Amino acid sequence: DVYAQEKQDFVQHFSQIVRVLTEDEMGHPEIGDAIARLKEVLEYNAIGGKYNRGLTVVVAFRELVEPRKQDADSLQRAWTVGWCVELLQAFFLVADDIMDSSLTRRGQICWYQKPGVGLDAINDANLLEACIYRLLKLYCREQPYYLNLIELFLQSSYQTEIGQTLDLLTAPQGNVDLVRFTEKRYKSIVKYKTAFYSFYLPIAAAMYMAGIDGEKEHANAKKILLEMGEFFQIQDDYLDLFGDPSVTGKIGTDIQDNKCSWLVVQCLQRATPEQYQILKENYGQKEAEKVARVKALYEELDLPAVFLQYEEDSYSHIMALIEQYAAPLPPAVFLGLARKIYK
Amino acid sequence: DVYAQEKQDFVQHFSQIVRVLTEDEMGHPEIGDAIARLKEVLEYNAIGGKYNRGLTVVVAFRELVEPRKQDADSLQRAWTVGWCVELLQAFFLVADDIMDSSLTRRGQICWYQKPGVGLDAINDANLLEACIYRLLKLYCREQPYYLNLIELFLQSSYQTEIGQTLDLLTAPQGNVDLVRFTEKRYKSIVKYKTAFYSFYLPIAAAMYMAGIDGEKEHANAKKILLEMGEFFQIQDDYLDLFGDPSVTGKIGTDIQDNKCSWLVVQCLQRATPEQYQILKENYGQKEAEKVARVKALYEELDLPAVFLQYEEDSYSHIMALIEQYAAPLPPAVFLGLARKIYK
Ligand SMILES: O=C(O)Cc1c(C(=O)O)[nH]c2c(Cl)ccc(Cl)c12
Ligand SMILES: O=C(O)Cc1c(C(=O)O)[nH]c2c(Cl)ccc(Cl)c12
Ligand SMILES: O=C(O)Cc1c(C(=O)O)[nH]c2c(Cl)ccc(Cl)c12
Ligand SMILES: O=C(O)Cc1c(C(=O)O)[nH]c2c(Cl)ccc(Cl)c12
Numbered sequence: 001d002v003y004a005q006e007k008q009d010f011v012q013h014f015s016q017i018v019r020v021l022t023e024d025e026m027g028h029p030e031i032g033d034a035i036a037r038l039k040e041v042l043e044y045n046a047i048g049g050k051y052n053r054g055l056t057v058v059v060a061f062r063e064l065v066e067p068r069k070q071d072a073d074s075l076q077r078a079w080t081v082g083w084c085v086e087l088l089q090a091f092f093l094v095a096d097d098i099m100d101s102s103l104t105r106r107g108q109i110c111w112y113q114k115p116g117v118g119l120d121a122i123n124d125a126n127l128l129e130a131c132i133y134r135l136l137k138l139y140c141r142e143q144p145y146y147l148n149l150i151e152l153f154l155q156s157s158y159q160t161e162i163g164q165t166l167d168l169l170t171a172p173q174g175n176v177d178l179v180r181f182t183e184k185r186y187k188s189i190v191k192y193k194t195a196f197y198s199f200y201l202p203i204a205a206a207m208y209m210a211g212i213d214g215e216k217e218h219a220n221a222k223k224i225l226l227e228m229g230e231f232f233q234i235q236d237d238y239l240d241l242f243g244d245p246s247v248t249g250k251i252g253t254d255i256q257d258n259k260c261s262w263l264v265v266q267c268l269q270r271a272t273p274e275q276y277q278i279l280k281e282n283y284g285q286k287e288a289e290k291v292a293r294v295k296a297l298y299e300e301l302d303l304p305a306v307f308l309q310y311e312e313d314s315y316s317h318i319m320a321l322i323e324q325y326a327a328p329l330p331p332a333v334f335l336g337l338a339r340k341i342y343k
Numbered sequence: 344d345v346y347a348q349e350k351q352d353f354v355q356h357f358s359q360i361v362r363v364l365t366e367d368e369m370g371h372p373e374i375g376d377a378i379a380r381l382k383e384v385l386e387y388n389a390i391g392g393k394y395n396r397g398l399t400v401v402v403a404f405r406e407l408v409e410p411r412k413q414d415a416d417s418l419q420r421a422w423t424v425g426w427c428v429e430l431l432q433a434f435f436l437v438a439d440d441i442m443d444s445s446l447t448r449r450g451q452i453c454w455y456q457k458p459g460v461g462l463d464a465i466n467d468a469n470l471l472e473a474c475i476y477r478l479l480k481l482y483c484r485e486q487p488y489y490l491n492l493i494e495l496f497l498q499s500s501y502q503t504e505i506g507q508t509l510d511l512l513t514a515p516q517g518n519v520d521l522v523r524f525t526e527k528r529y530k531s532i533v534k535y536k537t538a539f540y541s542f543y544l545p546i547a548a549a550m551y552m553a554g555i556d557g558e559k560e561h562a563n564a565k566k567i568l569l570e571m572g573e574f575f576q577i578q579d580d581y582l583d584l585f586g587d588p589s590v591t592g593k594i595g596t597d598i599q600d601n602k603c604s605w606l607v608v609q610c611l612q613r614a615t616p617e618q619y620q621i622l623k624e625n626y627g628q629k630e631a632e633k634v635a636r637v638k639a640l641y642e643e644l645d646l647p648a649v650f651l652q653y654e655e656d657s658y659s660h661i662m663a664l665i666e667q668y669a670a671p672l673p674p675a676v677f678l679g680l681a682r683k684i685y686k
Contacts, residue, residue: 031505031508033512034505034506034535035505037508037512038505038508095465095466095469098465099465099466101462116515120442120511122438122442122465122468123442123507123511125465126438126500127504127505127508130500130501130504133497134501137494146490147489147490150490150493151476151480154476157469158470158473158476158477161469161470161473162378163377164466165374165381165466165470166374166376168463168466169376169377169380188374192377
């Protein structure tokens with residue numbers, strides 16, 4: 001297990017990441033209390049997830065860079081850039097939890113819900129974002145792929161924020177409007193809000209650190225990764241309700257949160273005037289009774305089988321995509337990810 | 344009036360800035376509704392201020408770059424980078440208004456207070472930030488000072504966010520604690536939260552676009568600009584209460600908002616046990632009666648004269664700083680700014 005094993009080396013590097021970020025506090029004792037708050041923000045929000053995005057950078061790096069060019073320093077940079085992706089993720093989650101008024105994250109109370117934090121979490125989120133560029137400058141300033149990485153992280157933030165904008169417009173809190181839950185909107189939200197930074201960013205970062213800055217190579221990798229990103233979110237949506245909490249480790253809340261889920265989009269394409277009514281009067285509700293009604297309608301429309309068939313077609317398509325666009329990159333780079341997400 | 348005149352050319356460029364930013368909507372009709380929201384965010388938040396930060400970039404550019412190297416394209420880039428500073432300012436203001444629960448900005452209702460916006464303004468703020476880098480890439484990608492500007496804008500955001508962190512820790516909303524309102528804390532907040540991006544960033548940007556990337560030249564300019572930034576905020580604090588609304592165009596709210604103002608810091612250094620009590624039981628209050636009490640105490644401690652004497656000493660110091668660190672830059676670059684802020 002490239003992940004399960006390399007995971008230990010990644011997480012252990014975090015302590016060094018924090019140290020380096022809270023080091024400028026030296027020659028500037030004036031901002032000491034600010035640096036202390038930053039450390040607290042980092043420890044609370046960058047730790048606790050699965051680190052799949054960051055680990056992907058490392059895994060892809062090792063497979064893309066010849067073993068003789070994998071010096072202690074090159075690997076040092078790999079872990080750092082990987083942690084940068086985790087900081088981007090933390091920047092997003094802290095801000096997103098505020099915007100949808102979530103109560104918990106990773107099973108723990110949302111950072112902004114903490115007593116004494118509140119809306120100050122908005123500035124905390126921005127600090128997480130800024131740490132990304134601080135780390136890149138500190139570890140890759142002299143590297144030839146420095147500018148490429150800066151532009152990639154900036155582009156990934158923009159794409160994601162654009163996707164968040166689409167999502168906010170699509171599912172306005174306190175206003176259930178199933179009318180805008182179209183398949184085209186859903187695919188656009190997934191592509192911009194999730195796919196780009198979760199699947200393309202990590203590999204693309206590793207590609208640049210390996211010297212693979214070709215626009216065509218990046219365009220081909222993106223073609224594959226965005227499709228995998230699309231499947232990931234669709235499977236994530238499906239599991240949110242039909243998944244086993246004992247295996248998933250979480251309880252679904254998409255229905256209650258009136259999210260533009262793949263399930264609701266598919267349910268809206270197969271629903272009849274009467275079914276639609278039930279969905280319109282039960283979606284976005286917290287009462288278990290109303291949620292159960294939604295889930296009942298989904299099963300009736302046999303959405304679970306629809307997804308089963310979708311996963312099989314998606315997998316075949318991804319293999320074909322890999323078979324066609326992987327080269328000159330080692331197929332393993334993509335196959336490794338596919339094996340992980342296709343459960 | 345370099346400003347009053349050049350101001351027209353700057354503001355008129357905004358329409359082009361918006362056009363270029365909402366142009367990617369072409370090959371991506373999918374994010375059309377998102378791009379429409381972005382345009383609305385830009386128009387509402389980037390317009391309405393005084394544009395002094397952005398105009399400084401242009402003014403400094405013209406004085407630093409020989410007239411024969413000021414082609415239509417170079418000037419185009421100048422206006423753009425100047426507008427980037429205004430986007431940074433808009434990113435900050437939108438977020439700061441949310442964090443301190445302000446009602447209005449530039450006399451109009453705060454963006455987040457608008458019906459249908461609310462906490463979504465958090466993502467809108469991030470989009471404003473992202474547009475900065477989109478413009479730099481679109482206009483300065485091929486320029487030799489491209490990376491310098493990216494790093495400067497990133498560094499300026501970090502400094503500012505750090506200053507915001509210090510400020511939040513110093514004046515926690517709903518918790519008046521005059522104890523932490525020290526002169527050293529105040530100076531640190533001003534330096535990081537205001538001085539760097541308001542005075543150093545604009546000139547430093549112009550310096551890079553002129554080829555002046557010397558670390559020593561930048562270090563000397565910073566020495567001057569941070570001191571001017573410090574005076575600016577101190578005078579801004581003083582005018583917030585003792586200024587004439589007919590001339591300032593705004594009503595003071597620092598006392599009501601429990602801000603770490605220069606006035607309160609000075610009042611805490613000259614106040615007696617009994618005076619301190621009055622301040623402790625009237626600062627951060629909205630009732631006009633309580634505010635009037637604070638203002639009364641300030642006058643008694645003759646703070647207005649203290650400021651008058653401070654402005655004169657500050658001006659002499661700045662001239663000496665210019666006299667010493669301006670070269671090889673034209674003193675006019677700094678004198679122009681000094682004439683504007685020293686009223
Ligand atoms: O970590 C996650 O939240 C989802 C996730 C899983 C996974 O669940 O196995 N795996 C991932 C990989 Cl390999 C790349 C990127 C992402 Cl986002 C993931
Ligand atoms: O989504 C929500 O409104 C609140 C909420 C959160 C949460 O915010 O973490 N988690 C929930 C779970 Cl696990 C079950 C049912 C509900 Cl209502 C919630
Ligand atoms: O525009 C402002 O809010 C304050 C301000 C004034 C001014 O008030 O004259 N002038 C400025 C200059 Cl020249 C450079 C940077 C800044 Cl912030 C300012
Ligand atoms: O600062 C505040 O609490 C609200 C507030 C704002 C404002 O938020 O724009 N403006 C004010 C003025 Cl002009 C006078 C007195 C108060 Cl109380 C305020």
